[PDB]
Design a protein around this motif. Structure first.
Motif, PDB file in Angstrom:
ATOM      1  N   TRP A 200       0.819  -1.206   0.000  1.00  0.00           N
ATOM      2  CA  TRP A 200       0.000   0.000   0.000  1.00  0.00           C
ATOM      3  C   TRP A 200       0.855   1.259   0.000  1.00  0.00           C
ATOM      4  O   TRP A 200       0.447   2.286  -0.553  1.00  0.00           O
ATOM      5  N   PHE A 201       2.035   1.196   0.610  1.00  0.00           N
ATOM      6  CA  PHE A 201       2.919   2.345   0.774  1.00  0.00           C
ATOM      7  C   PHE A 201       4.300   1.888   0.328  1.00  0.00           C
ATOM      8  O   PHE A 201       5.107   1.434   1.151  1.00  0.00           O
ATOM      9  N   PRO A 202       4.590   1.953  -0.975  1.00  0.00           N
ATOM     10  CA  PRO A 202       5.860   1.422  -1.486  1.00  0.00           C
ATOM     11  C   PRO A 202       7.067   2.119  -0.876  1.00  0.00           C
ATOM     12  O   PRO A 202       7.054   3.326  -0.622  1.00  0.00           O
ATOM     13  N   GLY A 203       8.118   1.336  -0.643  1.00  0.00           N
ATOM     14  CA  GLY A 203       9.287   1.802   0.062  1.00  0.00           C
ATOM     15  C   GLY A 203       9.261   1.571   1.556  1.00  0.00           C
ATOM     16  O   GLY A 203      10.285   1.785   2.217  1.00  0.00           O
ATOM     17  N   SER A 204       8.133   1.138   2.108  1.00  0.00           N
ATOM     18  CA  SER A 204       8.012   0.859   3.529  1.00  0.00           C
ATOM     19  C   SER A 204       8.157  -0.637   3.788  1.00  0.00           C
ATOM     20  O   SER A 204       8.058  -1.468   2.883  1.00  0.00           O
ATOM     21  N   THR A 205       8.398  -0.972   5.055  1.00  0.00           N
ATOM     22  CA  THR A 205       8.552  -2.358   5.465  1.00  0.00           C
ATOM     23  C   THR A 205       7.191  -2.929   5.824  1.00  0.00           C
ATOM     24  O   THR A 205       6.504  -2.360   6.688  1.00  0.00           O
ATOM     25  N   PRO A 206       6.752  -4.020   5.192  1.00  0.00           N
ATOM     26  CA  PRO A 206       5.475  -4.616   5.572  1.00  0.00           C
ATOM     27  C   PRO A 206       5.550  -5.201   6.970  1.00  0.00           C
ATOM     28  O   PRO A 206       6.629  -5.622   7.425  1.00  0.00           O
ATOM     29  N   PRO A 207       4.435  -5.234   7.697  1.00  0.00           N
ATOM     30  CA  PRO A 207       4.457  -5.782   9.057  1.00  0.00           C
ATOM     31  C   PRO A 207       4.731  -7.278   9.064  1.00  0.00           C
ATOM     32  O   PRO A 207       4.444  -7.995   8.103  1.00  0.00           O
ATOM     33  N   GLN A 208       5.305  -7.741  10.177  1.00  0.00           N
ATOM     34  CA  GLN A 208       5.743  -9.128  10.280  1.00  0.00           C
ATOM     35  C   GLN A 208       4.582 -10.112  10.364  1.00  0.00           C
ATOM     36  O   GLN A 208       4.769 -11.292  10.049  1.00  0.00           O
ATOM     37  N   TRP A 209       3.399  -9.664  10.780  1.00  0.00           N
ATOM     38  CA  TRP A 209       2.247 -10.552  10.858  1.00  0.00           C
ATOM     39  C   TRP A 209       1.483 -10.652   9.546  1.00  0.00           C
ATOM     40  O   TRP A 209       0.544 -11.451   9.455  1.00  0.00           O
ATOM     41  N   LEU A 210       1.855  -9.872   8.538  1.00  0.00           N
ATOM     42  CA  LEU A 210       1.248  -9.934   7.211  1.00  0.00           C
ATOM     43  C   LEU A 210       2.305 -10.483   6.258  1.00  0.00           C
ATOM     44  O   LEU A 210       3.116  -9.738   5.707  1.00  0.00           O
ATOM     45  N   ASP A 211       2.288 -11.801   6.067  1.00  0.00           N
ATOM     46  CA  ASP A 211       3.273 -12.490   5.245  1.00  0.00           C
ATOM     47  C   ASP A 211       2.755 -12.820   3.851  1.00  0.00           C
ATOM     48  O   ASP A 211       3.401 -13.584   3.127  1.00  0.00           O
ATOM     49  N   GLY A 212       1.611 -12.266   3.459  1.00  0.00           N
ATOM     50  CA  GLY A 212       1.074 -12.509   2.137  1.00  0.00           C
ATOM     51  C   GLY A 212       0.247 -13.764   1.991  1.00  0.00           C
ATOM     52  O   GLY A 212      -0.097 -14.128   0.863  1.00  0.00           O
TER      53      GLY A 212
ATOM     54  N   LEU B  81      -2.811 -14.157   3.180  1.00  0.00           N
ATOM     55  CA  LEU B  81      -4.221 -13.805   3.135  1.00  0.00           C
ATOM     56  C   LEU B  81      -4.570 -13.145   1.805  1.00  0.00           C
ATOM     57  O   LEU B  81      -3.708 -12.541   1.161  1.00  0.00           O
ATOM     58  N   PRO B  82      -5.820 -13.275   1.357  1.00  0.00           N
ATOM     59  CA  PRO B  82      -6.237 -12.585   0.130  1.00  0.00           C
ATOM     60  C   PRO B  82      -6.169 -11.073   0.286  1.00  0.00           C
ATOM     61  O   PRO B  82      -6.510 -10.521   1.334  1.00  0.00           O
ATOM     62  N   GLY B  83      -5.733 -10.406  -0.779  1.00  0.00           N
ATOM     63  CA  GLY B  83      -5.610  -8.957  -0.766  1.00  0.00           C
ATOM     64  C   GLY B  83      -4.582  -8.440   0.216  1.00  0.00           C
ATOM     65  O   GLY B  83      -4.776  -7.374   0.814  1.00  0.00           O
ATOM     66  N   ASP B  84      -3.484  -9.171   0.393  1.00  0.00           N
ATOM     67  CA  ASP B  84      -2.458  -8.816   1.367  1.00  0.00           C
ATOM     68  C   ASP B  84      -1.528  -7.781   0.750  1.00  0.00           C
ATOM     69  O   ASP B  84      -0.757  -8.092  -0.165  1.00  0.00           O
ATOM     70  N   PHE B  85      -1.598  -6.546   1.250  1.00  0.00           N
ATOM     71  CA  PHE B  85      -0.755  -5.458   0.773  1.00  0.00           C
ATOM     72  C   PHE B  85       0.052  -4.825   1.900  1.00  0.00           C
ATOM     73  O   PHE B  85       0.606  -3.736   1.725  1.00  0.00           O
ATOM     74  N   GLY B  86       0.129  -5.485   3.051  1.00  0.00           N
ATOM     75  CA  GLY B  86       0.913  -4.991   4.171  1.00  0.00           C
ATOM     76  C   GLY B  86       0.411  -3.699   4.776  1.00  0.00           C
ATOM     77  O   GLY B  86       1.222  -2.861   5.194  1.00  0.00           O
ATOM     78  N   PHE B  87      -0.903  -3.517   4.844  1.00  0.00           N
ATOM     79  CA  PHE B  87      -1.511  -2.293   5.361  1.00  0.00           C
ATOM     80  C   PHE B  87      -2.071  -2.588   6.748  1.00  0.00           C
ATOM     81  O   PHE B  87      -3.166  -3.140   6.883  1.00  0.00           O
ATOM     82  N   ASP B  88      -1.306  -2.223   7.779  1.00  0.00           N
ATOM     83  CA  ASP B  88      -1.756  -2.341   9.167  1.00  0.00           C
ATOM     84  C   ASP B  88      -1.025  -1.307  10.013  1.00  0.00           C
ATOM     85  O   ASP B  88      -0.111  -1.639  10.777  1.00  0.00           O
ATOM     86  N   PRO B  89      -1.390  -0.026   9.881  1.00  0.00           N
ATOM     87  CA  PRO B  89      -0.735   1.002  10.710  1.00  0.00           C
ATOM     88  C   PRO B  89      -0.971   0.831  12.201  1.00  0.00           C
ATOM     89  O   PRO B  89      -0.074   1.116  13.003  1.00  0.00           O
ATOM     90  N   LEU B  90      -2.156   0.369  12.596  1.00  0.00           N
ATOM     91  CA  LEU B  90      -2.495   0.250  14.008  1.00  0.00           C
ATOM     92  C   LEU B  90      -2.097  -1.091  14.609  1.00  0.00           C
ATOM     93  O   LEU B  90      -2.222  -1.261  15.826  1.00  0.00           O
ATOM     94  N   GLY B  91      -1.627  -2.035  13.802  1.00  0.00           N
ATOM     95  CA  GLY B  91      -1.241  -3.340  14.315  1.00  0.00           C
ATOM     96  C   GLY B  91      -2.392  -4.155  14.859  1.00  0.00           C
ATOM     97  O   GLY B  91      -2.229  -4.858  15.865  1.00  0.00           O
ATOM     98  N   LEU B  92      -3.559  -4.081  14.217  1.00  0.00           N
ATOM     99  CA  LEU B  92      -4.735  -4.794  14.697  1.00  0.00           C
ATOM    100  C   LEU B  92      -4.676  -6.290  14.420  1.00  0.00           C
ATOM    101  O   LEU B  92      -5.410  -7.052  15.059  1.00  0.00           O
ATOM    102  N   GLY B  93      -3.831  -6.726  13.492  1.00  0.00           N
ATOM    103  CA  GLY B  93      -3.740  -8.131  13.151  1.00  0.00           C
ATOM    104  C   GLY B  93      -2.523  -8.824  13.728  1.00  0.00           C
ATOM    105  O   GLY B  93      -2.049  -9.818  13.170  1.00  0.00           O
ATOM    106  N   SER B  94      -1.999  -8.295  14.838  1.00  0.00           N
ATOM    107  CA  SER B  94      -0.813  -8.882  15.455  1.00  0.00           C
ATOM    108  C   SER B  94      -1.093 -10.283  15.989  1.00  0.00           C
ATOM    109  O   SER B  94      -0.281 -11.197  15.810  1.00  0.00           O
ATOM    110  N   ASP B  95      -2.233 -10.468  16.644  1.00  0.00           N
ATOM    111  CA  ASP B  95      -2.602 -11.777  17.168  1.00  0.00           C
ATOM    112  C   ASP B  95      -3.142 -12.641  16.033  1.00  0.00           C
ATOM    113  O   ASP B  95      -4.087 -12.226  15.352  1.00  0.00           O
ATOM    114  N   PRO B  96      -2.564 -13.822  15.778  1.00  0.00           N
ATOM    115  CA  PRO B  96      -3.042 -14.649  14.653  1.00  0.00           C
ATOM    116  C   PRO B  96      -4.493 -15.090  14.767  1.00  0.00           C
ATOM    117  O   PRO B  96      -5.178 -15.188  13.741  1.00  0.00           O
ATOM    118  N   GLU B  97      -4.984 -15.363  15.977  1.00  0.00           N
ATOM    119  CA  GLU B  97      -6.383 -15.750  16.137  1.00  0.00           C
ATOM    120  C   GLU B  97      -7.303 -14.584  15.792  1.00  0.00           C
ATOM    121  O   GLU B  97      -8.271 -14.738  15.032  1.00  0.00           O
TER     122      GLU B  97
END
Ligand code: CHL
Ligand code: CLA
Ligand code: CLA
Ligand code: CLA
Ligand code: CLA
Ligand code: CLA
Ligand code: CLA
Ligand code: CLA
Ligand SMILES: CC1=C[C@H](O)CC(C)(C)[C@H]1/C=C/C(C)=C/C=C/C(C)=C/C=C/C=C(C)/C=C/C=C(C)/C=C/C1=C(C)C[C@H](O)CC1(C)C
Ligand SMILES: CC1=C(/C=C/C(C)=C/C=C/C(C)=C/C=C\C=C(C)\C=C\C=C(C)\C=C\C2=C(C)CCCC2(C)C)C(C)(C)CCC1
Lengths: 49, 49, 154, 498, 49, 215, 93, 144
Positions: F17-29, F31-47
């Motif tokens: 979503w923001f080229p040149g930035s580091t994708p978050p570690q919990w978004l490894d691609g 999931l469908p539509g995975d573009f590494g967009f999680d500014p608030l870190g809401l998907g940190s917990d896998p469950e």
């Protein structure tokens, strides 16, 4: 004894009716189709000789 | 009424022929022969209904 | 076809009106008819890649020739839509035809463009012939390999 | 002011005369120069039709008159109307596409392309000639090019076919010349050959009948009329397919054009006398050729007999004295020029791969060659008078012209309407059978026939470019009829009480 | 399942398409869907009933 | 070589979503539509990430159905095949029943199937609807992507024409677009006081005006 | 305007909409002109293209020349050449 | 008898005096058109239908399509001319003068429309066709 009164009453007649498609189509082969084929050849003969 | 019932019966027969083609081959002389076709109630229940 | 040996004559007659394929009892259903011979594959190429491959396999005109051949029909459609005078369209079409044909005349000749006697000579001699025909002038070629076109000489 | 028609007639033969100045070998430069000349000429006719031809004018247009011989009162006179522009455009289109489809020809390419351009010029000169002797000269000017094309690029029996063709055409054309002499010398004061002043001439019944017979023998030799059709099967079967385009699409329509221009227009009373006997002849021609077609094992002979069968609808529309019948005849002229040429082209291209003649040994060609199968099936459907194609609407308009005709009363109007109907039962009977003997079934073909065996871009373009106008006319027939609704009416204006 | 789903739809059609010519839930004077559809219709045998 | 029915995770160098930035570690691609967009870190917990993926899928499907049912009838009314359609006023129309009893019936009927879906999410395979035919083998479906005879009567999933990951990202992207569209329609119906297609018509003409800044 | 309603006793009434429309002669000339330019463009482009069969060795190698009678002539030529080769072999030996 | 021998019959003159006073015939008539013989009822039905067909000719009126306007006008005008002759010839004697007057006005409108088409004048064509339109509406109202 495979009673012959029953064998040719229905089974032979019904099976021959269903298998030969009612004998119409074969007639359409014997009367029309082949005939028209011969007619074509005859016409071709009159166009060649 | 007859168009819908006929489409139902023809599609069921086609699905059943497709099912039988895996055991008798793709020849329509074998995959559409009701002589070699008995006992399909246990195998294709939806097509049976 | 062509036979180098006299073929065996047909002793038994055949029906003229019969289908010329194999017998229905010799037909491998599902294979001879392409009915069960397409199994899918994850390895399906791109649609536009296939379009580009099919277009390039036809050996399209390239450069200015490709430009005019690509831009002719949209230009004609736009000129007819914009109600520009049609005499300009005829002038442009004639110029395109003449330019295309002149460019095609300028293109080098291939072995298939010549007579079967020229095609079926020695391959090295044919290669030298094709190399010379695209290099020297037509008058020098005619004064050097003219007698090769007298097909009664050999 | 500018001599448009003279330039159009002169340009192809004049350009082909310069094809011998080329010292190049091969066929590349020759064929590209020939296609350049053909496309330039096509654009010239397109400009003429677009800017100087008015379809609403029933009179002659773009006339040009130059006195050439004073003794015959003979003039180079050219002119177009609604009757001639359709055949002229068809001639240009089919000749350009036949030049394009004759590209694998590497043996005597210079003479081949010169003869093609000469045929172009001769056909266009015939279709735009307003002088009787000029008409006869342009009629004669194709005996030599077709003879050379047949005898040098034909089939197995090409030489006998060429001899039969040239002798039959000369035998018809001497009667054509006798008719020309008779009509052009009927003037009490001085001889005259202009068609405009000859359209008002009045003849006695017997002399008009004799002149009609003299013209009709030639127009029945050229346009195949039973039993003067025997040159056509061996001429078209044993000819090059590129030449077969011109033979079955252009040269066959010249007899019909002469029938409208001379027999129907110049001599209306004799035409009214002869037309009911022409109707029976046309119906029997349809039946006879549609029955001869299944008897032919050769593919090209079957297509030629199909062309003879399709000419019967033109004969019917000629003989049925209505505007609708003449419009249907012109539409069938255009439709057959679009169908027979493409069918012959596909047959020749298929033979160039399969190398077989008789239909009982060409099974399974649909497996290595599917595109030519598709084109053959589509053009057979067009031959089949299928709706969405020009053939169906042409035959339907001919049927309507017969039904609406006032000359015939009831029972013949029945027995002819039934007649051609039998034809459209017989027309499937061979045609699909032809396909069934040429593409259906399974045969094991060579691996080398798996690739580089089907029709290339050039053949696909040719077949598509002839197939598209068929659909365009079958959807909207008035793309053609609107060019000639007016002039045909004028031709009919002499057949009513005055 | 792509073969079975039209079979289910045609089963539903076969079961419930006979109620367009018969009155569905007739309560007194009620015309069915088909006769209201074909309100002007030729009926030579029952032109008075 | 054949048809792969497993989702293929995107490579770590996928577009973001923001080229040149580091994708978050919990978004490894994965999931469908995975573009590494999680500014608030809401998907940190896998469950919670799985629950949020299912919620996004549900919101996507409901939003696509919603926007279709808004736009297609509105496009029919503008054409003229609908007499008095208005999606804002559609809830206050007169039907064969009161909105309250219809809401209760809808609550019961929908809480059946939403609760069967809940049981499937909690226990995959506990509820099976695809028939168990005598020799047909039913493949195990992913949670949130069910479907044999009923939900996938086309067999367009499970590796058929486009790979499962590709079609799933297509679905998720169309769903996100539809959620944004529906929220836009909800705000436009109370701001502009008009319909969607009418607002589009007055925006296409003179787009410098007739905007958010002119009501 | 161009709408006619007919009522028939015992029959459903009919509403007929009619529009006598025809293409102008200018439009027909435009269709002809565009088809002529399309034909010229296609002739140029698909003549510039390669021919998969007529340029192949399967056609030119067998003796093909675009002429409709090359197969029969080639057959008779190879029989005559075989007989001449036998004559040459008997001359040498 | 199988076929006619002489030239085909031309425009048969009307016996109800619906033609032009000076010439005895109308200019828009075309010879060679097949008119089916149905009778007075069929002629009335065809008259109403073809009046509606000519009132369907608003779209054809334009600078580029005046020739088709003239062609359709001649075709339908011949048809309604002979149908009007048939229905006047079988009308009651009390109803013949008004029907003849209506036919005369309609055919004068036809001539004016054809004259306007011939000069390729579009506003004149529109005005003449409006008069023709009110006359055709009167024709269908009379013959319903
Ligand atoms: C689930 C989503 C849902 C949403 C987003 C809306 C949205 C809306 N409703 Mg609806 N409704 C929804 C479900 C339901 N509504 C209704 C019954 C009504 C009524 C009776 C009314 C609305 C009205 C409205 C508008 C409120 C301001 C707004 C457009 C009001 C309106 O007139 O604006 C369109 C209105 O009066 N809705 C019922 C039945 C109880 C629903 C059941 O699910
Ligand atoms: C998803 C795409 C989307 C689209 C295509 C539209 C389309 C339209 N809107 Mg809506 N709108 C949206 C979402 C969207 N809206 C959202 C998310 C909101 C608020 C939560 C609004 C609220 C809104 C208001 C208040 C108004 C409109 C109006 C309009 C028009 C634009 C002019 C303007 O002033 O509004 C711009 C308004 C915004 C608040 C910007 C929201 C943009 C979102 C955040 C992202 C969309 C960007 C993305 C690239 C979409 C792809 C474009 C295309 C490929 C589909 C246009 C017909 C105006 C109208 O029609 O007046 C006559 C107007 O008054 N819209
Ligand atoms: C879900 C929400 C989302 C959000 C909030 C963003 C946010 C952003 N994107 Mg990302 N992006 C997204 C999804 C999203 N993207 C997706 C799904 C993709 C496809 C992989 C991309 C791919 C992408 C690209 C290729 C680019 C951006 C760009 C941008 C930035 C420029 C926008 C701007 O400043 O103009 C405000 C715009 C208004 C209309 C007001 C912005 C920070 C740009 C970039 O990051 O550098 C500038 C850009 O070049 N994005
Ligand atoms: C319906 C709710 C919804 C939910 C639950 C999700 C959930 C998810 N998103 Mg998706 N997404 C949505 C809508 C939603 N999305 C929309 C509308 C867009 C387009 C703008 C996107 C675009 C998007 C991108 C580009 C990416 C994701 C990704 C993710 C995943 C990780 C991020 C996260 O932890 O989410 C947790 C989310 C929630 C619990 C929602 C919290 C929202 C707060 C509480 C308020 C809502 C804000 C406000 C009201 C917005 C109004 C509209 C605006 C225009 C004004 C997760 C599966 C990432 C991915 O890996 O894909 C799987 C990623 O890269 N999403
Ligand atoms: C009537 C009872 C009912 C019940 C028990 C559920 C139950 C559920 N819903 Mg469903 N839902 C319902 C009606 C119901 N729904 C209706 C009427 C709609 C239409 C708007 C939806 C649309 C819906 C959405 C869009 C979402 C849920 C989600 C959920 C889950 C969230 C749990 C919760 O919030 O509590 C749960 C499985 C959420 C989900 O599935 O999270 C994984 C989610 O995002 N539901
Ligand atoms: C996402 C879910 C969804 C929901 C909740 C609604 C909700 C509604 N629809 Mg919409 N609709 C949708 C999707 C949806 N629609 C889709 C996908 C389409 C196809 C384009 C439509 C097309 C549509 C039409 C054509 C109509 C509605 C109308 C209605 C209303 C009552 C009719 C009805 O529901 O019972 C009917 C139930 C049956 C099972 C039968 C209600 C507001 C009606 C309306 O606007 O009310 C005046 C109406 O006329 N809808
Ligand atoms: C908007 C696009 C969209 C897309 C691309 C996907 C994509 C995916 N879905 Mg999802 N889905 C959607 C919307 C979408 N969905 C909606 C709105 C819902 C709620 C009903 C669901 C709920 C859902 C379920 C329950 C299932 C899927 C499944 C799947 C897979 C099937 C392929 C596909 O749907 O066809 C791509 C093409 C289309 C969506 C075209 C749009 C359809 C048009 C608008 C209408 C359909 C035409 C016609 C009316 C239908 C036939 C008539 C017949 C009933 C008589 C694929 C991964 C299956 C799964 O994942 O199993 C592996 C599964 O069974 N989806
Ligand atoms: C600017 C260039 C751009 C490019 C190159 C792409 C490229 C792509 N898009 Mg995206 N997209 C864009 C802008 C762009 N998009 C915008 C502005 C929007 C509106 C928010 C979208 C919304 C979008 C949707 C809704 C979908 C795509 C899809 C696709 C992919 C399928 C290609 C087809 O075929 C392709 C990678 C498809 C996809 O893969 O998602 C499922 C799809 O369905 N795109
Ligand atoms: C807001 C606004 C505003 C202004 O005013 C205007 C405008 C601008 C217009 C607007 C915008 C809009 C938008 C953008 C939207 C979007 C949407 C979407 C995306 C949708 C989807 C949507 C989508 C959808 C429906 C979809 C659906 C689907 C489905 C059902 C599916 C089905 C299926 C499946 C599963 C599977 C199987 O095997 C098959 C089948 C059976 C087939
Ligand atoms: C007469 C004439 C002409 C003209 C013509 C025209 C006028 C045309 C038009 C046309 C048109 C206006 C058309 C339209 C449209 C079309 C279409 C739309 C089509 C489509 C198609 C498709 C899509 C496909 C097809 C195919 C093929 C190609 C083959 C095979 C088969 C098939 C069928 C598949 C010309 C100039 C030539 C010249 C001569 C004379």
């Amino acid at each position: 004894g495979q009673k012959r009164i029953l064998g040719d009453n229905i089974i032979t007649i019904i099976y021959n009716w269903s298998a030969n498609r009612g004998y119409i189509d074969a007639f359409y082969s014997t009367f029309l189709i082949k005939g028209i084929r011969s007619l074509s050849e005859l016409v071709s003969f009159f166009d060649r000789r | 009424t007859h168009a819908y019932s006929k489409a139902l019966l023809f599609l069921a027969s086609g699905s059943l022929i497709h099912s039988m083609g895996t055991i008798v081959g793709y020849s329509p002389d074998k995959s559409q022969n009701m002589v070699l076709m008995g006992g399909l109630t246990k195998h294709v229940p939806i097509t049976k209904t | 076809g062509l036979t180098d040996i006299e073929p065996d004559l047909n002793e038994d007659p055949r029906d003229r009106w019969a289908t010329n394929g194999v017998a229905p009892e010799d037909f491998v259903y599902g294979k001879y008819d392409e009915h069960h011979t397409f199994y899918e594959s994850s390895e399906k190429g791109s649609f536009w890649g296939a379009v580009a491959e099919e277009y390039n396999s036809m050996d399209p005109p390239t450069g200015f020739q490709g430009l005019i051949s690509w831009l002719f029909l949209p230009a004609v459609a736009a000129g007819m839509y914009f109600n520009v005078p049609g005499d300009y369209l005829f002038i442009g079409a004639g110029l395109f035809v003449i330019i295309f044909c002149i460019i095609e005349m300028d293109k080098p000749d291939q072995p298939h463009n010549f007579e079967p006697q020229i095609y079926n000579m020695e391959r090295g001699a044919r290669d030298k012939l094709i190399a010379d025909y695209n290099t020297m002038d037509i008058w020098d070629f005619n004064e050097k390999y003219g007698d090769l076109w007298d097909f009664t000489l050999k | 002011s500018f001599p448009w028609l003279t330039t159009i007639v002169v340009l192809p033969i004049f350009a082909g005369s310069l094809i011998f100045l080329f010292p190049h070998r091969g066929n590349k430069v020759i064929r590209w120069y020939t296609i350049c000349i053909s496309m330039i000429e096509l654009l010239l006719m397109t400009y003429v039709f677009f800017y100087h031809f008015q379809p609403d004018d029933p009179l002659i247009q773009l006339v040009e008159d130059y006195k050439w011989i004073n003794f015959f009162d003979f003039h180079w006179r050219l002119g177009i109307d609604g009757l001639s522009i359709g055949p002229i455009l068809l001639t240009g289109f089919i000749t350009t596409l036949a030049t394009l489809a004759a590209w694998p020809v590497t043996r005597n390419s210079q003479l081949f392309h010169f003869l093609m351009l000469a045929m172009y010029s001769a056909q266009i000169g015939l279709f735009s000639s307003r002088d009787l002797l000029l008409f006869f000269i342009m009629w004669e000017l194709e005996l030599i090019p077709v003879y050379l094309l047949l005898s040098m690029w034909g089939g197995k029996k090409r030489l006998y076919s060429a001899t039969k063709f040239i002798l039959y055409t000369a035998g018809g054309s001497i009667f054509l010349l006798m008719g020309v002499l008779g009509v052009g010398l009927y003037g009490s004061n001085e001889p005259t050959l202009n068609l405009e002043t000859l359209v008002n001439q009045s003849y006695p019944v017997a002399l008009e009948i004799i002149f009609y017979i003299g013209f009709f023998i030639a127009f029945a030799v050229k346009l195949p009329i039973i039993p003067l059709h025997t040159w056509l099967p061996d001429t078209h079967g044993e000819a090059h397919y590129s030449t077969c385009m011109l033979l079955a699409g252009i040269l066959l329509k010249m007899g019909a054009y002469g029938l409208v221009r001379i027999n129907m227009e110049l001599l209306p009373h004799a035409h009214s006398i002869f037309s009911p006997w022409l109707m029976i002849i046309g119906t029997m021609q349809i039946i006879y050729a549609a029955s001869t077609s299944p008897g032919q094992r050769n593919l090209k002979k079957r297509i030629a007999y199909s062309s003879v069968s399709h000419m019967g609808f033109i004969i019917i529309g000629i003989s049925s004295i209505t505007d609708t019948g003449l419009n249907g005849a012109i539409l069938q002229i255009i439709s057959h020029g679009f169908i027979g040429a493409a069918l012959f082209f596909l047959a020749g291209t298929s033979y160039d791969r399969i190398r077989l003649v008789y239909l009982d040994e060409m099974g399974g060609i649909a497996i290595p060659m599917p595109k030519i199968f598709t084109l053959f099936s589509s053009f057979s459907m067009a031959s089949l008078a299928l709706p969405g194609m020009s053939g169906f609407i042409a035959e339907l308009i001919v049927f309507f012209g017969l039904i609406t005709s006032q000359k015939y009363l009831l029972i013949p109007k029945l027995l002819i309407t039934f007649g051609m109907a039998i034809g459209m039962i017989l027309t499937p009977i061979y045609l699909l059978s032809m396909s069934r003997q040429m593409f259906y079934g399974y045969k094991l073909f060579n691996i080398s026939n798996s690739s580089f065996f089907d029709s290339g871009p050039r053949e696909l373009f040719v077949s598509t470019s002839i197939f598209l106008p068929v659909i365009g006319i079958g959807v909207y027939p008035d793309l053609v009829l609107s060019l000639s609704v007016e002039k045909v009416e004028a031709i009919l204006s002499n057949y009513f009480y005055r | 399942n792509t073969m079975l789903f039209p079979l289910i739809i045609l089963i539903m059609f076969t079961l419930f398409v006979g109620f367009i010519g018969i009155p569905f839930n007739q309560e007194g004077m009620d015309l069915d869907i088909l006769t209201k559809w074909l309100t002007p219709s030729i009926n030579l045998l029952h032109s008075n009933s | 070589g054949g048809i792969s029915s497993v989702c293929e995770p995107l490579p770590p160098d996928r577009p973001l979503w923001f080229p040149g930035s580091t994708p978050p570690q919990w978004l490894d691609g994965s999931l469908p539509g995975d573009f590494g967009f999680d500014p608030l870190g809401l998907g940190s917990d896998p469950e919670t990430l799985r629950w949020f993926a299912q919620a996004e899928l549900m919101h996507s499907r409901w939003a696509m159905l919603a926007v279709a049912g808004i736009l297609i009838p509105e496009w029919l009314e503008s054409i003229g095949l609908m007499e008095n359609f208005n999606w804002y006023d559609a809830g206050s129309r007169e039907y064969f029943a009161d909105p309250t009893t219809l809401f209760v019936v809808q609550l019961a009927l929908m809480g059946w199937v939403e609760g069967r879906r809940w049981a499937d999410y909690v226990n995959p395979g506990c509820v099976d609807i695809e028939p168990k035919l005598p020799n047909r083998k039913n493949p195990k479906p992913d949670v949130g992507y069910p479907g044999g005879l009923w939900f996938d009567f086309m067999m367009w999933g499970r590796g058929s024409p486009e790979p499962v990951m590709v079609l799933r990202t297509k679905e998720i992207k169309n769903g996100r677009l539809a959620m944004l569209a529906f929220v836009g329609l909800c705000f436009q119906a109370v701001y502009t006081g008009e319909g969607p297609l009418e607002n589009l018509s007055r925006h296409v003409a003179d787009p410098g005006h007739c905007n958010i800044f002119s009501a | 305007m161009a709408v006619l309603v007919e009522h028939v006793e015992g029959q459903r009434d009919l509403i007929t909409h009619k529009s006598i429309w025809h293409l102008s002669d200018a439009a027909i000339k435009n269709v002809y002109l565009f088809y002529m330019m399309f034909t010229c463009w296609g002739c140029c482009v698909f003549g510039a293209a390669k021919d998969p069969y007529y340029d192949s060795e399967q056609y030119r190698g067998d003796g093909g020349d675009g002429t409709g009678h090359w197969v029969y002539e080639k057959q008779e030529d190879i029989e005559e050449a075989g007989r001449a080769a036998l004559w040459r072999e008997e001359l040498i030996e | 008898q199988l076929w006619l021998d002489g030239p085909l019959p031309g425009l048969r003159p009307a016996e109800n005096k619906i033609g032009n006073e000076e010439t005895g015939t109308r200019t828009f008539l075309k010879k060679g058109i097949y008119m089916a013989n149905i009778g007075t009822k069929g002629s009335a039905l065809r008259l109403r239908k073809y009046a509606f067909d000519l009132l369907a000719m608003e779209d054809l009126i334009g600078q580029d399509t005046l020739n088709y306007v003239r062609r359709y006008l001649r075709f339908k005008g011949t048809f309604m001319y002979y149908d009007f002759d048939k229905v006047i010839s079988a009308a009651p004697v009390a109803d013949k003068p008004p029907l003849t007057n209506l036919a005369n006005r309609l055919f004068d409108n036809f001539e004016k429309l054809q004259e306007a088409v011939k000069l390729k004048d579009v506003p004149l064509t529109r005005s003449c066709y409006d008069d023709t339109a009110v006359t055709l509406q009167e024709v269908m109202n009379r013959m319903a």
